[PDB]
Design a protein around this ligand. Structure first.
Ligand SMILES: CC(C)(COP(=O)(O)OP(=O)(O)OC[C@H]1O[C@@H](n2cnc3c(N)ncnc32)[C@H](O)[C@@H]1OP(=O)(O)O)[C@@H](O)C(=O)NCCC(=O)NCCS
Length: 155
């Protein structure tokens, strides 16, 4: 962490415009105004990521109670293409893993990855996420439509 050029910051009504902008470039699915209203309310579960004080990424999560578990759902975690492989993803994922660890009541953390997202699969598997399912036709508008469900067990 020391000397690091990467820093995470809070999402606020002041920089939320910048979050949406980042998400529009990085992620193939569009998020509605509800998404953005909700992110302003999850506190530490939404962050902007900065490299040399430039906003280049963001992570947005939600608490999920499904399958009789308490789950952390990563809805978006990503950064701008020219800044990849610099540790920014790791900083964002470690931020969320650290919250779950301090809280202690989460059963797992999971997310959906388009089957073509080789680099995302590589990234999450490095941290102990596993493909636990491939959902056919998960995505409505993009090709390919299928998504892997990646999950890391915490319990
Ligand atoms: C997936 C993503 C978040 C990774 O972020 P990042 O900052 O590049 O990740 P990091 O620099 O912390 O790298 C983490 C480790 O993951 C693995 N990894 C990450 N990207 C990889 C790639 N393209 N190919 C192979 N391994 C990769 C590596 O082991 C890497 O460590 P290393 O650089 O020492 O080899 C990034 O590629 C991204 O923003 N993707 C677009 C958004 C997306 O699809 N995210 C998934 C949800 S839909």
């Amino acid at each position: 962490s020391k000397g690091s050029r990467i820093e995470l910051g809070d999402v606020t009504p002041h920089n939320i415009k910048q979050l949406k902008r980042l998400n529009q470039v990085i992620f193939p699915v569009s998020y509605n105004d509800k998404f953005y209203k909700d992110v302003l309310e999850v506190g530490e579960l939404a962050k902007l990521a900065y490299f040399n004080d430039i906003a280049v990424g963001a992570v947005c999560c939600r608490v999920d109670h499904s399958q009789n578990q308490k789950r952390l759902y990563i809805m978006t975690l990503g950064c701008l293409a020219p800044y990849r492989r610099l540790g920014i993803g790791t900083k964002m994922l470690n931020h969320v893993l650290n919250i779950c660890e301090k809280d202690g009541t989460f059963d797992n953390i999971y997310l959906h990855v388009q089957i073509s997202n080789e680099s995302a699969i590589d990234f999450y598997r490095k941290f102990g996420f596993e493909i636990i399912e491939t959902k056919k036709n998960y995505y409505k508008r993009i090709e390919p439509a299928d998504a892997h469900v990646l999950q890391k067990n915490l319990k």
